[PDB]
Amino acid sequence: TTCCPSIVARSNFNVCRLPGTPEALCATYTGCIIIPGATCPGDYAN
Prior knowledge:
monomer; mainly alpha; 2 helices; about 40% helix
């Protein structure tokens, strides 16, 4: 599951992913985290 700290960070993550750049790297660049479970932590609810 991808979990982002802010709406703008989610927007940056979606932009970074558009050309195909790997989710793990886009998460690093934007501050989003990729976790194994279904429910995002409350500070990463966007």
